[PDB]
Write a protein that binds this ligand. Structure first.
Ligand SMILES: *[C@@H]1O[C@H](CO)[C@@H](O[C@@H]2O[C@H](CO)[C@@H](O[C@@H]3O[C@H](CO[C@H]4O[C@H](CO)[C@@H](O)[C@H](O)[C@@H]4O)[C@@H](O)[C@H](O[C@H]4O[C@H](CO)[C@@H](O)[C@H](O)[C@@H]4O)[C@@H]3O[C@@H]3OC[C@@H](O)[C@H](O)[C@H]3O)[C@H](O)[C@H]2NC(C)=O)[C@H](O[C@@H]2O[C@@H](C)[C@@H](O)[C@@H](O)[C@@H]2O)[C@H]1NC(C)=O
Ligand SMILES: *[C@@H]1O[C@H](CO)[C@@H](O[C@@H]2O[C@H](CO)[C@@H](O[C@@H]3O[C@H](CO)[C@@H](O)[C@H](O)[C@@H]3O[C@@H]3OC[C@@H](O)[C@H](O)[C@H]3O)[C@H](O)[C@H]2NC(C)=O)[C@H](O[C@@H]2O[C@@H](C)[C@@H](O)[C@@H](O)[C@@H]2O)[C@H]1NC(C)=O
Ligand SMILES: *[C@@H]1O[C@H](CO)[C@@H](O[C@@H]2O[C@H](CO)[C@@H](O)[C@H](O)[C@H]2NC(C)=O)[C@H](O)[C@H]1NC(C)=O
Ligand SMILES: *[C@@H]1O[C@H](CO)[C@@H](O[C@@H]2O[C@H](CO)[C@@H](O)[C@H](O)[C@H]2NC(C)=O)[C@H](O)[C@H]1NC(C)=O
Ligand SMILES: O=S(=O)(O)O/N=C(/Cc1ccccc1)S[C@@H]1C[C@H](CO)[C@@H](O)[C@H](O)[C@H]1O
Ligand SMILES: CC(=O)N[C@@H]1[C@@H](O)[C@H](O)[C@@H](CO)O[C@H]1O
Ligand SMILES: *[C@@H]1O[C@H](CO)[C@@H](O)[C@H](O)[C@H]1NC(C)=O
Ligand SMILES: *[C@@H]1O[C@H](CO)[C@@H](O)[C@H](O)[C@H]1NC(C)=O
Ligand SMILES: *[C@@H]1O[C@H](CO)[C@@H](O)[C@H](O)[C@H]1NC(C)=O
Ligand SMILES: *[C@@H]1O[C@H](CO)[C@@H](O)[C@H](O)[C@H]1NC(C)=O
Ligand SMILES: *[C@@H]1O[C@H](CO)[C@@H](O)[C@H](O)[C@H]1NC(C)=O
Ligand SMILES: [Zn+2]
Length: 499
């Protein structure tokens, strides 16, 4: 019988108690990263994250930091492989920058051979060290030209352009890459990029944020989500029909969260909690497992929710060999009004729920995850059991899928000096507490999880936060980004992997 801790202090950092041997022999352990966050603009075209961070510096981060140079993995990709080698990692998730291999967006306009070579070298180097690549085709960095031509994912033209880009990737790298991720965190771009405008492209309704250049927070998130599903499905169909000879697997990446009732004895809070599961997870998992959106969304969103044609529904349903599940935290849910007529209405309000990290009785869900200096009441707290609950939910609600945890990590303040940043015991606690519960859910619920990739191989540009927070298991000096030194967490993970 496995027992896991939910509150501080944690003792899972002791590799004698918890290590890789606790998992199945073939279980993959590694770290993850994304192109915009680690490469730099050198050698590639411009994408919407370059556009967004430059047009709206205040939105790029409190420090106005962006991905211009960041950790310079373009030049130091070998250093990334060295970190993985040091960790004895068996997996590494990275993304291909669409702007690096097809700077002009549309494949017919030509490809960047040097960009293709960049990834060939990285992939070859990973395989030579016994590291299995998990490659994300689209980690939000859409070529700026496509956003300017037809507003990217807001238009159906994105489907064919994304398909042509994915085809190039399968053609060029598919002989070595056997695990593909289509779109990173399906829920994110529609809501943050077209709803709240916290992320690129930065579209929203005029009254939601006057800085948005255009948009409609009430309708656009649904249009974008719909196109993401169609684009994703078209790519999976292409992969399974034209690249089955490569013997690989492909799937979408879902940002997952668990939800608990703000008040567990209040039917309204309980209902809000179930609505959240449908609006947050079901929005994409419904189409992916059934070819239709959840009924609660159909009823609530009405005319603003696009419909799938029979052909599209068939294309989207079952469009995955596995699911890349990102998990960070859990929230309490309570009812909230949905003012559809208000000029400031957003798609996110449709769930009819308010989210918090503190319940009705004043209980904080778990240890501190992220401290918000602007407002103490806006701090994020984590919940280790959430990963158990999410995995259990996916197995029982979504037809026992093959799962790879594609992201799981925690940040530490950017204000900390080198020594403080290196002594990241809070990261060891976060990672081990989640790994404990992951091992527990695999054994108790028989969830088909076959890999775990911790977020951020090293410190990089963090979307919306610039360099004010660090997520890496390896430290990076911004005055000399060459080195990738394992922090205490990286050293612990090394021991966890090879006890
Ligand atoms: C997994 O996918 C399944 C489909 O492959 C889902 O089942 C479908 O669920 C649909 C509801 O979402 C359901 O469609 C409704 O059918 C009503 C009856 O239509 C028949 O009878 C009519 C007699 O007058 C006739 O005119 C029709 O031609 C049909 O013969 C219909 O009245 C409904 O329309 C109203 O409600 C919808 C909102 O749901 C409005 O959009 C619409 O304007 C109207 O107000 C509705 O029809 C749909 O209307 C919209 C239109 O775009 C669609 O084409 C049209 O179908 C449908 O019958 C079933 N299909 C099957 C095979 O059962 C399943 O949903 C779950 O299970 C169903 C039974 C139901 O309980 C849902 O609430 C559940 O979510 C999906 N499962 C999951 C997990 O999501
Ligand atoms: C988690 O949710 C539950 C269920 O909603 C909360 O319990 C409910 O708390 C209500 C008070 O906010 C209770 O209603 C009140 O009852 C007294 C006594 O009769 C009455 O004088 C009040 O006017 C009020 O009555 C309601 O008024 C509005 C009407 O629409 C409604 O029909 C009336 O009932 C309610 O009885 C109670 N439900 C039950 C079954 O216990 C719960 O609130 C916490 O516990 C209750 C018992 C009370 O001590 C609250 O002060 C306390 O916050 C809530 N838990 C938390 C931590 O918020
Ligand atoms: C976002 O787009 C929606 C849909 O075009 C707008 O909602 C429409 O608003 C008009 C004017 O009040 C109504 O006549 C329609 O019935 C609404 N459509 C539906 C079914 O919601 C909404 O106003 C737009 N929001 C902004 C701020 O531009
Ligand atoms: C807020 O969360 C706390 C912690 O989960 C809940 O307290 C637990 O409630 C159960 C059921 O009554 C008790 O058996 C446990 O002993 C409590 N644990 C603790 C640490 O107190 C509390 O019920 C939640 N509040 C609401 C309204 O949902
Ligand atoms: O559900 S969302 O659409 O908000 O996306 N969820 C994310 C999870 C999350 C939210 C807030 C803080 C930390 C993590 S978005 C989150 C943004 C992080 C900062 O750039 C980034 O490091 C991480 O890879 C990414 O998943
Ligand atoms: C208050 C503040 O400092 N933030 C402003 C914001 O109000 C403004 O809409 C935006 C224009 O792009 O520029 C930001 O710097
Ligand atoms: C790994 O953890 C297990 C408990 O799950 C323990 O029995 C074993 O001794 C540990 N391995 C090492 C080498 O410490
Ligand atoms: C790396 O892991 C393999 C497989 O568990 C093990 O045999 C090997 O000794 C490890 N190498 C190091 C130096 O940790
Ligand atoms: C597979 O490739 C062929 C040759 O380019 C193409 O004709 C066919 O449409 C492709 N199948 C798809 C789009 O899945
Ligand atoms: C506009 O939206 C904001 C954010 O949800 C909300 O706080 C405010 O009350 C709304 N104003 C109106 C029109 O009620
Ligand atoms: C930058 O760091 C590298 C690796 O530690 C080192 O070799 C080089 O001398 C440093 N350059 C500077 C800033 O002096
Ligand atoms: Zn710049």
């Amino acid at each position: 019988e496995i027992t896991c801790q939910e509150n501080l202090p944690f003792t899972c950092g002791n590799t004698d108690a918890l290590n890789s041997s606790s998992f199945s022999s073939d279980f993959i352990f590694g770290v993850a990263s994304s192109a915009y966050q680690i490469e730099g603009t050198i050698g590639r075209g411009l994408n919407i994250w370059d556009g967004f961070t430059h047009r709206y510096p205040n939105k790029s981060g409190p420090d106005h930091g962006n991905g211009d140079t960041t950790c310079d993995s373009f030049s130091y990709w070998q250093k990334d492989i060295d970190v993985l080698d040091e960790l004895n990692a068996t997996g590494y998730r990275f993304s291909i920058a669409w702007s690096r291999i097809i700077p002009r967006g549309k494949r017919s306009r030509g490809v960047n051979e040097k960009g293709i070579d960049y990834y060939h070298g990285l992939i070859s180097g990973l395989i030579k060290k016994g590291i299995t690549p998990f490659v994300t085709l689209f980690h939000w960095d859409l070529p700026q030209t496509l956003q300017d031509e037809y507003e990217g994912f807001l238009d159906p033209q994105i489907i064919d352009d994304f398909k042509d880009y994915a085809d190039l990737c399968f053609e060029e790298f598919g002989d070595s890459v056997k695990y593909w991720l289509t779109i990173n965190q399906l829920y994110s771009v529609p809501t943050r990029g077209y709803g709240s405008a916290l992320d690129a492209p930065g579209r929203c309704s005029p009254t939601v944020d006057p800085s948005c250049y255009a948009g409609n927070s009430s309708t656009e998130p649904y249009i974008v989500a719909h196109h993401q599903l169609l684009a994703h499905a078209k790519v999976v169909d292409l992969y399974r029909k034209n690249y089955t000879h490569q013997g690989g697997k492909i799937g979408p990446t879902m940002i997952t969260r668990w939800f608990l009732p703000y008040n567990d004895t209040d039917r309204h809070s309980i209902a809000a909690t179930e609505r959240m599961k449908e609006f947050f997870l079901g929005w994409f998992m419904g189409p992916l497992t059934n070819g239709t959106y959840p009924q609660i969304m159909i009823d609530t969103v009405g005319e603003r929710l696009p419909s799938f044609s029979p052909e599209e529904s068939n294309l989207v349903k079952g469009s995955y060999d596995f699911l890349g599940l990102n998990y960070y935290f859990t929230q309490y849910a309570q009812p909230s009004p949905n003012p559809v007529n208000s000029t400031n209405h957003t798609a996110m309000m449709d769930a009819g729920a308010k989210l918090t990290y503190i319940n009705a009785s004043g209980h904080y869900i778990g240890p501190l995850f992220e401290k918000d200096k602007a407002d103490s009441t806006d701090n994020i707290y984590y919940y280790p059991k959430g990963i158990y609950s999410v995995m259990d939910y996916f197995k029982n609600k979504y037809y026992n899928p093959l799962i790879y945890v594609t992201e799981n990590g925690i940040s530490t303040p950017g204000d900390e000096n080198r020594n403080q940043s290196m002594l990241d015991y809070t990261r060891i606690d976060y990672l081990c507490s989640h790994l404990c519960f992951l091992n527990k859910v695999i054994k108790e619920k028989d969830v088909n999880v076959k890999g775990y990739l911790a977020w951020a191989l090293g410190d990089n540009y963090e979307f919306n936060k610039g360099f004010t927070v660090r997520f890496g298991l390896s430290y990076i000096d911004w005055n000399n980004v060459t080195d990738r030194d394992l922090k205490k967490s990286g050293q612990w993970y090394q021991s966890f992997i090879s006890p």
